[PDB]
C-alpha cells in the first residue's frame, strides 16, 4: 500500500497507489467507484481489506529563465506540489523526466503555485518579472 | 447628503447580508467552468464503439493487433472530447475578456 | 473579470497509462500540443484581464 505499483485485481492490471480504504464498503460491494466513473477503491480477493487506488504523484513542470541570451541558469517550478514530493521523486523510481539535477535541493522553495527548485526565495519585493502564480514571481538578479 | 450616503451604503450590506443570489453573474462563471470539466470527465466513460471505455480492459484482453482497432476508437472520441472542451473554452474566454 | 485557469494533459486524459495508446496518439501529429497552446493562451489572458 502507499506505493506506486502495477496492481492486478481479478484480471484488472492497473497502475496506482493502493491504500486501506476508510470508505464503509458494504460486504457485497467489491470495487469502489469515483465520481469520474473510475476505480477509486477495490476489494483484495485474498485478505478482505478494501483498497483506495490513487494515481502516483504528478504535476506540471515549468522552467524559469532570464532567457538563453542573458544566461543558461534556470529555476524549476513543480506545479501544485509540496516540497516533500520532490525528495519522493528519485531515479530509483524512474520518472518520465530522465533529468534530475534539481533533486540536489537546498533551494527548494514552496509556492502556493507549487514546488519551485533552482530559484532562491528572498524577502525583498519587486515588480513582477516572470509570473509564477499565487503572488509569486521570479527574476534573474545578482 | 452624508446621512443619505451612509444609509445607502448601509442598505448595500443589508442586501448582500440577506439575499443568496446577488452575485449570480460570478457564480455562473464558476458553474460554467465546473460543468465543462465535469462533462469532460464524463466523456471518459463512453465507449465510442470500442468493446470497453477502459484501456486496461482492452489491453488485458485483445492482443496488440486486435487492441489497436479498439484503442483508436477511444483515441478518436476522446480527442474530439478535448477539442470540444477547448473550443468551448476559447469562445467562453472571449466573453470574459 | 477572469475565469478558472485550467491545463489538460492530452496524453493522460486520452491515454490512461497506455503506451500503445501513446504510440497510436502520435499518429495525429501536433493536436495535443495545439490544445495545450490554446489552454495556455487562455490561462495567461486571465492574468492580463
Amino acid at each position: 500500500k502507499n506505493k506506486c505499483v502495477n496492481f492486478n485485481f481479478n484480471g484488472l492490471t492497473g497502475t496506482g497507489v493502493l491504500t486501506e480504504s476508510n470508505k464503509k464498503f458494504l460486504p457485497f460491494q467489491q470495487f469502489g467507484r469515483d465520481i469520474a466513473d473510475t476505480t477509486d477503491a477495490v476489494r483484495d480477493p485474498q485478505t478482505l481489506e478494501i483498497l483506495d487506488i490513487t494515481p502516483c504523484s504528478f504535476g506540471g513542470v515549468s522552467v524559469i529563465t532570464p532567457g538563453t541570451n542573458t544566461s543558461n541558469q534556470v529555476a524549476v517550478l513543480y506545479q501544485g506540489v509540496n516540497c516533500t514530493e520532490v525528495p519522493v521523486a528519485i531515479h530509483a523510481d524512474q520518472l518520465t523526466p530522465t533529468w534530475r539535477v534539481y533533486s540536489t535541493g537546498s533551494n527548494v522553495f514552496q509556492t502556493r503555485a507549487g514546488c519551485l527548485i533552482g530559484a532562491e526565495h528572498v524577502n525583498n519585493s519587486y515588480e513582477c518579472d516572470i509570473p509564477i502564480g499565487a503572488g509569486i514571481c521570479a527574476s534573474y538578479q545578482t | 447628503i452624508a446621512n443619505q450616503f451612509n444609509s445607502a451604503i448601509g442598505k448595500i450590506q443589508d442586501s448582500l447580508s440577506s439575499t443568496a443570489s446577488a452575485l449570480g453573474k460570478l457564480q455562473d462563471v464558476v458553474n460554467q467552468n465546473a460543468q465543462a470539466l465535469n462533462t469532460l470527465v464524463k466523456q471518459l466513460s463512453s465507449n465510442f464503439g470500442a468493446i470497453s471505455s477502459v484501456l486496461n480492459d482492452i489491453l488485458s484482453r485483445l492482443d496488440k493487433v486486435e487492441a489497436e482497432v479498439q484503442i483508436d476508437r477511444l483515441i478518436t472520441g476522446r480527442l474530439q472530447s478535448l477539442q470540444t472542451y477547448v473550443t468551448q473554452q476559447l469562445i467562453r474566454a472571449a466573453e470574459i475578456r | 473579470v477572469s475565469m478558472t485557469k485550467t491545463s489538460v494533459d492530452c496524453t493522460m486524459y486520452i491515454c490512461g497509462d497506455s503506451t500503445e495508446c501513446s504510440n497510436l496518439l502520435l499518429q495525429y501529429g501536433s493536436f495535443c500540443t495545439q490544445l495545450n497552446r490554446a489552454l495556455t493562451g487562455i490561462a495567461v489572458e486571465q492574468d492580463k484581464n
Binding site: 502556493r112 499565487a134 | 470539466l37 470527465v41 | 489538460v8 490512461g16 492574468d47
Partner: peptide
Amino acid sequence: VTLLICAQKFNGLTVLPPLLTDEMIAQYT
C-alpha cells in the same frame, strides 16, 4: 460565491492559481 476536482486530476485535468492572490487584489482595491 463558492469556488470531482480530484477525479478530474486523476485524469490530467488541473486548475492553475491566479498570479494575483485575493490579498493582492484587495491591496489594489
